[PDB]
Amino acid sequence: MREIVHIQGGQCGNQIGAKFWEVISDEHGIDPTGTYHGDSDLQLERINVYYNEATGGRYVPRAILMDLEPGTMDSVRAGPFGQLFRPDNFVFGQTGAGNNWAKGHYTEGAELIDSVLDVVRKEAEGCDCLQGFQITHSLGGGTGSGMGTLLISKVREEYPDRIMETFSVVPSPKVSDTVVEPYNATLSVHQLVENADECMVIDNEALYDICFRTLKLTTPTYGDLNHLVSAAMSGVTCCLRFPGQLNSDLRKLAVNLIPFPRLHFFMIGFAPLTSRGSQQYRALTVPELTQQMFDAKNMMCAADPRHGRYLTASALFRGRMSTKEVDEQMLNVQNKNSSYFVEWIPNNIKSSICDIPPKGLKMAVTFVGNSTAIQEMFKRVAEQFTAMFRRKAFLHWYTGEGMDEMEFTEAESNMNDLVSEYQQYQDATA
Amino acid sequence: MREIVHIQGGQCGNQIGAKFWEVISDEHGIDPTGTYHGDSDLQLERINVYYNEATGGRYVPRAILMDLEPGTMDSVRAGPFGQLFRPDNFVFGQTGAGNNWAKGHYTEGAELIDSVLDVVRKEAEGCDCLQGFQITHSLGGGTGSGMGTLLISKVREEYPDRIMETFSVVPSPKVSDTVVEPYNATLSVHQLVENADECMVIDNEALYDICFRTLKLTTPTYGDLNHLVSAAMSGVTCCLRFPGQLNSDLRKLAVNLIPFPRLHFFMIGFAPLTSRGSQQYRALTVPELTQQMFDAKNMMCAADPRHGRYLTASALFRGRMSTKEVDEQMLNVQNKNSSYFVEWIPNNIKSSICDIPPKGLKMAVTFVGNSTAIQEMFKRVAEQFTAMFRRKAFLHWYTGEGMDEMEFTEAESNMNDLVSEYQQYQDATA
Amino acid sequence: PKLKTNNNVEVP
Amino acid sequence: MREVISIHVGQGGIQVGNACWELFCLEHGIQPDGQMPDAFNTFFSETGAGKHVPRAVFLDLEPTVIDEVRTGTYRQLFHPEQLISGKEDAANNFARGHYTIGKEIVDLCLDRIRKLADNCTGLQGFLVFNSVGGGTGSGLGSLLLERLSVDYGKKSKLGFTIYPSPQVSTAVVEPYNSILSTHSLLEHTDVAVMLDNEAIYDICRRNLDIERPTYTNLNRLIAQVISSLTASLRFDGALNVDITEFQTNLVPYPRIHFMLSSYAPIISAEKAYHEQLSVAEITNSAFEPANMMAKCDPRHGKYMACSMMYRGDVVPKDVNASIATIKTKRTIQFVDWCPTGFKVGINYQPPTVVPGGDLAKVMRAVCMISNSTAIAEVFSRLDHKFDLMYAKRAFVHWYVGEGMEEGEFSEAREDLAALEKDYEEVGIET
Amino acid sequence: KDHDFVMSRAKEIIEQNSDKDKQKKEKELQLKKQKEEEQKKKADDMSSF
Numbered sequence A, B: 001m002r003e004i005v006h007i008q009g010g011q012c013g014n015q016i017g018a019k020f021w022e023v024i025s026d027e028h029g030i031d032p033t034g035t036y037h038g039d040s041d042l043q044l045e046r047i048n049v050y051y052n053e054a055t056g057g058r059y060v061p062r063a064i065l066m067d068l069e070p071g072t073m074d075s076v077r078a079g080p081f082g083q084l085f086r087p088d089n090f091v092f093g094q095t096g097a098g099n100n101w102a103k104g105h106y107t108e109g110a111e112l113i114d115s116v117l118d119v120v121r122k123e124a125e126g127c128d129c130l131q132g133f134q135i136t137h138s139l140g141g142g143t144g145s146g147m148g149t150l151l152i153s154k155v156r157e158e159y160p161d162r163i164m165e166t167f168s169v170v171p172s173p174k175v176s177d178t179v180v181e182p183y184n185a186t187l188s189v190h191q192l193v194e195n196a197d198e199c200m201v202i203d204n205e206a207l208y209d210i211c212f213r214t215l216k217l218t219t220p221t222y223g224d225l226n227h228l229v230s231a232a233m234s235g236v237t238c239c240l241r242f243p244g245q246l247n248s249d250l251r252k253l254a255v256n257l258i259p260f261p262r263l264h265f266f267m268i269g270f271a272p273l274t275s276r277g278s279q280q281y282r283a284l285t286v287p288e289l290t291q292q293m294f295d296a297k298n299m300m301c302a303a304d305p306r307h308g309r310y311l312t313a314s315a316l317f318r319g320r321m322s323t324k325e326v327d328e329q330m331l332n333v334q335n336k337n338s339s340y341f342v343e344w345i346p347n348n349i350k351s352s353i354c355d356i357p358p359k360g361l362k363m364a365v366t367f368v369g370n371s372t373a374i375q376e377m378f379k380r381v382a383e384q385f386t387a388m389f390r391r392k393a394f395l396h397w398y399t400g401e402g403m404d405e406m407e408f409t410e411a412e413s414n415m416n417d418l419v420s421e422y423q424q425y426q427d428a429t430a
Numbered sequence C: 001p002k003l004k005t006n007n008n009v010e011v012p
Numbered sequence D: 001m002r003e004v005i006s007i008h009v010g011q012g013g014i015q016v017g018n019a020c021w022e023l024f025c026l027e028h029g030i031q032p033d034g035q036m037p038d039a040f041n042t043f044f045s046e047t048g049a050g051k052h053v054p055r056a057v058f059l060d061l062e063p064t065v066i067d068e069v070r071t072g073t074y075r076q077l078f079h080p081e082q083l084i085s086g087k088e089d090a091a092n093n094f095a096r097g098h099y100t101i102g103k104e105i106v107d108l109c110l111d112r113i114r115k116l117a118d119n120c121t122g123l124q125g126f127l128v129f130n131s132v133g134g135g136t137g138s139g140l141g142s143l144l145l146e147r148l149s150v151d152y153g154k155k156s157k158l159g160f161t162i163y164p165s166p167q168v169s170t171a172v173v174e175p176y177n178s179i180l181s182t183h184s185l186l187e188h189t190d191v192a193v194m195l196d197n198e199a200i201y202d203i204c205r206r207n208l209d210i211e212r213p214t215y216t217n218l219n220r221l222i223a224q225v226i227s228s229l230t231a232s233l234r235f236d237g238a239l240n241v242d243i244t245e246f247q248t249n250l251v252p253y254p255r256i257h258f259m260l261s262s263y264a265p266i267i268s269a270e271k272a273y274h275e276q277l278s279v280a281e282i283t284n285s286a287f288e289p290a291n292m293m294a295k296c297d298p299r300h301g302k303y304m305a306c307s308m309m310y311r312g313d314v315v316p317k318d319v320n321a322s323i324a325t326i327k328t329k330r331t332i333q334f335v336d337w338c339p340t341g342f343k344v345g346i347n348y349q350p351p352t353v354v355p356g357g358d359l360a361k362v363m364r365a366v367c368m369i370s371n372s373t374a375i376a377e378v379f380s381r382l383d384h385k386f387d388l389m390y391a392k393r394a395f396v397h398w399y400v401g402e403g404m405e406e407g408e409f410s411e412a413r414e415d416l417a418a419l420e421k422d423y424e425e426v427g428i429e430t
Numbered sequence E: 001k002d003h004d005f006v007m008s009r010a011k012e013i014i015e016q017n018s019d020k021d022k023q024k025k026e027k028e029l030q031l032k033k034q035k036e037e038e039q040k041k042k043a044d045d046m047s048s049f
Ligand SMILES: Nc1nc2c(ncn2[C@@H]2O[C@H](COP(=O)(O)OP(=O)(O)OP(=O)(O)O)[C@@H](O)[C@H]2O)c(=O)[nH]1
Pocket: A245, A246, A252, D009, D010, D011, D012, D013, D015, D016, D062, D089, D090, D091, D092, D093, D131, D132, D133, D134, D135, D136, D137, D138, D162, D164, D169, D170, D171, D174, D197, D215, D216, D218, D219
């Protein structure tokens, strides 16, 4: 019951899913052949959340994979746990977008999306009670940031009451791999605010910083960043698949973390994270988890959370632990940092406890906090956008496929209005 | 009791029968030597439906094979299960028709048909209680589309109360193998509506599409198309040869699927169909069967069923299953698609259950639906006919054998009237 | 569903 | 011939119901299977031969807790179809569980209530348990109370609500639904008992010497209080008290029925037997402000009436000799218009111990239910918390979009202001 | 302070571009669209008729 379907688009989203599904399968004891080989009874009670049942007793994820080029899905199939995905759900084009947002949203993405919407509708109509959808995509690419966001609007138009999740990677100015990143980032943020019920920003720069400083491993690769993102993704829905002292589905988090409908851009972090050589030194206790959870360097975004004030915060503890300690520590982390918490909403931290810890760990915490410090990312994105747009650089590529500069002006104005009205509440006082 | 005889004409019909009889013999455990070697008692109880009994304990089909050239029947005899056919039933001419409808219906087909009608009369007068006849022929050929349709009228004139089936392959404009296809298609459709109690259209283009997309086999051949058509043919009369929860002979389907006597052109489809590599992934359940049964690509015709509204529908489930699930799923497939079902006739889906599944499969479904979307085939056939006829192209071949243009004009007018009055009920409202 | 306008008025 | 029905709604309600139902089964000698290996009739019913069925119903929209109940050791005890469960959680939204999803479930609960009530012949009243700071709990409790108040009328209903702590909180939006639920049960419930978690945490820490308590330890103390309250109905005693004999002794006026409880002694077996546990010292400990079961200071207000229950081998003369000492003390002062304010009950059955629990076995215990003027502080602080966020209309869109009107928040505020004015008006001397 | 000035100015700039574009585009678009629609309808109806 109350299950969700997985939809991913683009190369970055496909690579994120290729590790997210591996993590989920390892958590539920599903072999790469789709056969259950788990140890505990609880591993099968709520498997309908992510997995479907077919004849022969094997399980198949309800994931939908889409891209405008076939290479990435032809590569993910040969990887581990690549056989679980149903071949029918693979939809792809023969041309690609070339990191051009217009091509992936107006000319090419519009004709292809009917086939993927057909299978999306097939998956949603069938399921017992829908909880919602979760979306993984990147804002630094053309086909992803175009087709995914248009699909968001199409899904929202047909299921207005369901919940919608988006895990979005925004292009940081530090590690830049594409010159046309500001254009399709700014165009995508315009559409994303209007339809997504929840959005979670993730930055490659913050992932590299975490890998270099906390884990202290010499050579980070995309596999480590994907593993961290996958652990963070799994931590959110853990209590929906396992029993606990205070169950809290996604809708309950939506109620408690979004004060106003347009303020739904969160930054997350996962604890504990320790190096291989120091994993024996540390002792896992609730104070040790909560001190690392609110650490500024532990956030999955380069945004500095002590440059603003938290509107609200959430924590999803895992493992068996006493609730009194959790509540007193949450109170203590809020009394010692009163300057960084907005004062006109008292008791702005939500807590939840799940009795099933991750495989290999005795305690774990997932942190989701809505803070005013996120304005800095939109500020720098808009700064680069307006630095590049004033000369009409690279504009002809977009304008040759039916798009105009008016949609750029409206997007810039709406993004600046969002930036302004997000900080409006930072200076608000009672 | 209530048995039927088999009559086939032309090369296409002979090739269809050469696989239909193989499928029937394999279902009833009859060796290619006519000796029973089956396992179950039920395999022999109702064998009188299709097979006759002769001395020595062997069985012989009551099939009649006719063609205007001897090559195809001289070739089908050397194939597997070719010895079952009685040599006396083979009737053929020495000239052929050359894909000319006039030659196969006026000059050559008229003189030969007396001999085949003699054996047809011998077969029908003898049998215990006649149920009816089933006819397999192609509308793209001359001798078939002429002699078969004239034989339809001759049989109808002598047995007005019996039921008549016709499985007709109409020439699609996509895969065209004969230039004079529109003429003998249009001439044949004129006569076919007046006499056939049931008609089932089959298209080679739809068979290729199914083989390429659902089964995903690399190199389709006529053997695969024949096998699919044979499975669909066998599925219709299964409950007449085996016990079941709700037996339903052909006459019961005739009552429930034909609202008005001139609307008897159905399109069919068979489920399940899965690729070799995915036959282990899937689990056979009633929802899985019914979702594939109403799939648009699964129809044996290129006609798109979501371009019109179903007047009525029928399903013939096979295997042992609960009736409550079947009824609730039929209700669900009709509540979620109310836009594609005509509203002035409520509860327009018929269901039947047979406890004997096909050999090798645990569940199977045969779908027969009367829909308004079939108008598109007659529209394109008439379009090609009127494009070719306005210049009197290839007309001299037909007019040199006693035929005139008046019979072409009447045929075109009657076909257009059929097209119009078939869609008349699509816009009808209560 | 109702939309909140910038003046806190809920309009259907 | 005396019966009572207990209603459990929400996660906290179900988790405290489990806690009370181990204790009752243990106290009446009934095994977890429901089989005994005439006092049971108050809580149970005889099935004719063998097992006993509790007179309780479990409600929740989120299925996890009920599924945990239906698989534990107590799966055989409860009737299978009185554990009403939903599919979608209210997610801390009060408007959801009062207007959207609770209405479709409330009819089944009312049918179950009728089916349980027709069995009872001497129905004393109803008990209800619900954690106030949640969507489904508060909303469904409000709706059930409103339906019962008109279906049955004058039957007495008792509410063991758990209000949020002064500063410790798990959610961020719980003041809104707490205020709304207080509005709803102010005019609909005959008795409401305060149960916030912080006071009980302090009790456990100070007396039980547990530094890491969980919810089970809290629920066991609540279960002991319930057992002490209802002991007089099912055991012989020198001075009996019935449920209907409360509004005549503790409720001076129809509006004022919120009171706070205390229990004594609370002590572990490691140091319990070193001291004599006389009646005087336990009745002194029960009146200590630090042993209040709700985090309120009785020194800040007057007393109105005290109803306090004893059980064990206590003698009435020792009780009178201790009531005199309390009347003597200068730190405890009663209201002017109440010369005597004590109602005393004495029972013979000593409290029962649960194996593996915290409390030890003792021969004397005291449970007090005291109505005092100091309770207005919790209302004032909840009102202050509510006003801070209602000034900017935060989180209101999550409630307006679930069918609730804009003005519904204001009238709850007006009723709280009226209640606070009434509490001030009553406490002034003449 | 300059950030704010630029954002306001950019917003203004957006408005300026939009205004010029909008007026020219609107006039041209309306005339052309009307003509095209009429012609297609026109010829198709006559031949069909
Ligand atoms: N004393 C006590 N309080 C609890 C317990 N569990 C939850 N609570 C309280 O209940 C409040 C929230 O309501 P819950 O009972 O957890 O959830 P709910 O009532 O089912 O409402 P939903 O969130 O919609 O499911 C929290 O603030 C807790 O203080 C418990 O086991 N014991």
